[PDB]
Amino acid sequence: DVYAQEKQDFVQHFSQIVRVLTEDEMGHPEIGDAIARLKEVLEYNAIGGKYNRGLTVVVAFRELVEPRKQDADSLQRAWTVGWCVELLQAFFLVADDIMDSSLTRRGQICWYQKPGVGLDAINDANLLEACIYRLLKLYCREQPYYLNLIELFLQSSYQTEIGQTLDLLTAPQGNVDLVRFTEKRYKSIVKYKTAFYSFYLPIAAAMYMAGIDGEKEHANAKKILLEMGEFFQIQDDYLDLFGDPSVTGKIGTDIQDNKCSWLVVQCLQRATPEQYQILKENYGQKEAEKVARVKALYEELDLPAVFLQYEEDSYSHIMALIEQYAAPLPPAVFLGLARKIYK
Amino acid sequence: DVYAQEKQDFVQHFSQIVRVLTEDEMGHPEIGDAIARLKEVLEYNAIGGKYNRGLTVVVAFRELVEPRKQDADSLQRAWTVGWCVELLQAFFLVADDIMDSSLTRRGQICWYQKPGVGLDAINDANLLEACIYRLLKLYCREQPYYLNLIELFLQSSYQTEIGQTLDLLTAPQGNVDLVRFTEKRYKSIVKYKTAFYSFYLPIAAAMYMAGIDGEKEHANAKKILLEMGEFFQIQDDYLDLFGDPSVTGKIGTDIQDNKCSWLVVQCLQRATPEQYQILKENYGQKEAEKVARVKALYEELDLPAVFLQYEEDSYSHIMALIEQYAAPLPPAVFLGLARKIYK
Ligand SMILES: O=P(O)(O)C(O)(Cc1cccnc1)P(=O)(O)O
Ligand SMILES: O=P(O)(O)C(O)(Cc1cccnc1)P(=O)(O)O
Ligand SMILES: [Mg+2]
Ligand SMILES: [Mg+2]
Ligand SMILES: [Mg+2]
Numbered sequence: 001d002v003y004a005q006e007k008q009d010f011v012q013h014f015s016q017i018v019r020v021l022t023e024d025e026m027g028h029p030e031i032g033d034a035i036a037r038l039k040e041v042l043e044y045n046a047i048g049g050k051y052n053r054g055l056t057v058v059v060a061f062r063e064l065v066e067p068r069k070q071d072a073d074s075l076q077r078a079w080t081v082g083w084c085v086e087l088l089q090a091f092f093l094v095a096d097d098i099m100d101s102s103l104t105r106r107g108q109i110c111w112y113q114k115p116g117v118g119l120d121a122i123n124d125a126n127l128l129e130a131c132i133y134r135l136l137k138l139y140c141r142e143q144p145y146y147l148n149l150i151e152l153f154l155q156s157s158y159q160t161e162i163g164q165t166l167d168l169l170t171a172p173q174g175n176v177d178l179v180r181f182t183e184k185r186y187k188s189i190v191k192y193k194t195a196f197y198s199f200y201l202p203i204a205a206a207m208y209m210a211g212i213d214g215e216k217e218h219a220n221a222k223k224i225l226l227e228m229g230e231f232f233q234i235q236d237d238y239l240d241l242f243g244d245p246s247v248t249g250k251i252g253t254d255i256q257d258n259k260c261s262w263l264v265v266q267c268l269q270r271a272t273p274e275q276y277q278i279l280k281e282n283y284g285q286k287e288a289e290k291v292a293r294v295k296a297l298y299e300e301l302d303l304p305a306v307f308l309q310y311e312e313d314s315y316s317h318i319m320a321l322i323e324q325y326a327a328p329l330p331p332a333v334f335l336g337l338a339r340k341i342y343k
Numbered sequence: 344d345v346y347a348q349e350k351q352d353f354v355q356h357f358s359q360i361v362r363v364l365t366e367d368e369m370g371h372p373e374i375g376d377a378i379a380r381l382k383e384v385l386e387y388n389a390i391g392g393k394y395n396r397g398l399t400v401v402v403a404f405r406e407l408v409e410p411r412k413q414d415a416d417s418l419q420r421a422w423t424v425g426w427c428v429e430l431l432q433a434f435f436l437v438a439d440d441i442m443d444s445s446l447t448r449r450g451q452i453c454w455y456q457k458p459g460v461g462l463d464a465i466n467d468a469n470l471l472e473a474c475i476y477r478l479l480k481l482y483c484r485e486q487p488y489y490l491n492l493i494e495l496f497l498q499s500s501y502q503t504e505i506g507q508t509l510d511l512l513t514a515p516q517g518n519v520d521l522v523r524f525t526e527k528r529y530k531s532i533v534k535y536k537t538a539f540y541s542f543y544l545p546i547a548a549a550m551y552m553a554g555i556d557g558e559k560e561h562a563n564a565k566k567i568l569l570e571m572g573e574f575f576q577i578q579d580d581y582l583d584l585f586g587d588p589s590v591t592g593k594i595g596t597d598i599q600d601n602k603c604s605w606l607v608v609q610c611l612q613r614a615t616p617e618q619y620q621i622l623k624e625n626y627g628q629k630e631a632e633k634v635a636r637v638k639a640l641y642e643e644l645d646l647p648a649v650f651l652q653y654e655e656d657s658y659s660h661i662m663a664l665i666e667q668y669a670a671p672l673p674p675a676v677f678l679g680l681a682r683k684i685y686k
């Protein structure tokens with residue numbers, strides 16, 4: 001597996017990242033306490049995932065750049081840009097867990113729930129964002145793709161924040177209106193809140209680093225990747241309720257939080273007016289017994305089977321898109337990633 | 344007054360800013376609801392101040408660039424970069440009001456306290472940040488100072504977040520330890536949390552736009568501006584307690600929030616062991632009667648007089664720094680700004 005090959009060198013580079021970020025303290029000991037906090041935030045929130053987004057930069061880089069140009073220094077930059085993608089995710093997740101009133105992430109208590117942290121986590125999240133641009137300046141400032149990467153990270157952040165806005169507006173607390181929950185609304189939410197930053201960003205970053213800056217090549221890569229991103233968020237929604245928290249590392253809140261989940265959208269398409277009534281009375285509430293009623297209804301409608309069928313249809317569709325849109329990039333770049341999220 | 348001269352053209356440009364930012368909706372009606380929210384966030388949080396930071400970019404621009412190069416297009420860019428500085432401030436203030444548990448800002452309820460908003464304001468604050476970089480790309484991408492401005496805004500954000508970290512770490516809730524509150528700690532907090540972004544940033548932005556990118560010229564401008572920034576935060580701390588909320592537009596929380604305020608630092612330098620005991624028992628608590636006891640102690644020690652004396656000594660010191668470090672920039676750039684914050 002090409003991801004497993006690269007993983008150990010990638011994960012080890014995190015020590016170099018922590019080191020260069022905390023060497024700001026060298027020439028300014030007055031900010032020592034702040035740098036110690038930054039280190040703690042990095043170690044708690046950036047470590048412990050599967051690193052699929054960051055590894056995707058490294059894997060794609062190795063398949064897009066001639067082996068003769070994969071010197072030690074170029075590899076260091078690739079690992080760094082990979083870690084920047086992981087830091088962007090950590091920024092979004094720390095804030096997301098506050099806004100979604102979540103309990104655990106990656107098997108441990110959410111950062112904001114940690115005693116002594118609380119809403120100070122807002123500033124911690126913004127520091128994670130700032131670290132991205134410090135790392136890009138330190139490692140990539142002299143490279144011809146520097147400005148392209150800065151603009152890519154900024155644009156991806158904007159798109160993701162627009163998506164979070166749609167997510168939050170469609171799920172007002174204490175206000176259950178099921179008519180908002182359409183398939184058309186759902187697809188817009190997930191394209192912006194997840195697809196750009198999770199799938200387009202890491203491959204696009206590798207493309208720029210390899211000198212592939214063509215409008216056309218980026219457009220074709222988007223066609224494949226935004227569809228993969230849609231599937232990924234559908235899977236995330238399914239696992240919120242039907243996944244095992246010991247595997248997922250997080251407790252689900254979509255029902256309690258009144259979210260426009262793929263599950264509720266599918267339920268609404270299949271529900272009798274009597275099932276619709278059950279949904280309306282129990283959705284968007286914290287009571288455990290009410291959450292249980294919605295899950296029972298989902299099982300009654302065999303939504304787990306609908307998801308399995310969607311996974312298969314989606315895989316076939318993404319493979320057809322790869323056949324059409326991959327060239328001139330090697331199909332392996334997209335196939336490797338697909339194997340990672342569908343398997 | 345050179346600020347009042349420029350104000351009306353600057354404030355009117357806000358309509359053009361809102362317009363170009365919400366024309367993202369044109370070719371993507373799927374995100375319409377999000378763009379409507381962005382407009383609301385802009386109008387509530389970016390409007391209603393004195394615009395001293397943003398106007399400083401415009402004023403400095405007019406004094407640093409030859410009148411022959413102040414065409415309509417260059418002025419538009421100056422107003423835009425000014426508004427970017429105001430957006431950076433709005434980003435920091437929306438988050439700051441959450442973390443400081445504040446009630447009002449600019450005479451109205453804090454955005455996060457508004458019914459229906461709550462912790463969704465976290466994402467709203469990040470959208471304000473993102474708007475900065477959209478505006479820089481749209482107006483300045485073809486200019487030779489583009490990358491310098493991007494790096495300046497990113498660096499200023501990092502510095503400000505490091506300062507916020509020091510502010511929050513020195514003021515842990517429910518944990519009153521007065522020994523942390525030293526003059527040396529105070530000066531470090533305010534340099535990072537306020538001085539860079541409030542004073543260095545707007546003048547530095549104008550300097551880059553005028554082609555003044557010299558390490559030496561920026562170093563000299565910092566010497567003056569970081570000192571002005573220190574005074575500004577001292578004044579802000581004084582006004583938290585002794586200002587009139589109808590003028591300041593905000594209710595003070597520094598005592599309740601256990602903050603390392605200039606007032607508490609000065610109090611500690613002058614207090615008998617018996618006054619120290621009063622401070623220790625009443626500081627960092629929400630009870631109105633306990634806040635009143637600290638204010639009475641501050642008045643007992645004549646801290647309002649100490650502040651008046653500090654204001655005069657500081658003004659003299661900043662003027663001496665202008666005499667030494669202004670050249671080759673026109674002294675008027677620094678004098679105009681000084682008149683604005685000391686008067
Ligand atoms: O990991 P989570 O909280 O299930 C999630 O996928 C996290 C997330 C945050 C920001 C953008 N996209 C996804 P969400 O959308 O809140 O369900
Ligand atoms: O306007 P405020 O809340 O008095 C303040 O000046 C706002 C602020 C926010 C961020 C950086 N610097 C100042 P603070 O430091 O919280 O006293
Ligand atoms: Mg979430
Ligand atoms: Mg969420
Ligand atoms: Mg989820």
Ligand SMILES: [Mg+2]
Nearest residue numbers: 439440443445
């Ligand atoms: Mg405050």
Ligand SMILES: [Mg+2]
Nearest residue numbers: 439440443510
């Ligand atoms: Mg504050």
Ligand SMILES: [Mg+2]
Nearest residue numbers: 579580583597
């Ligand atoms: Mg204050």
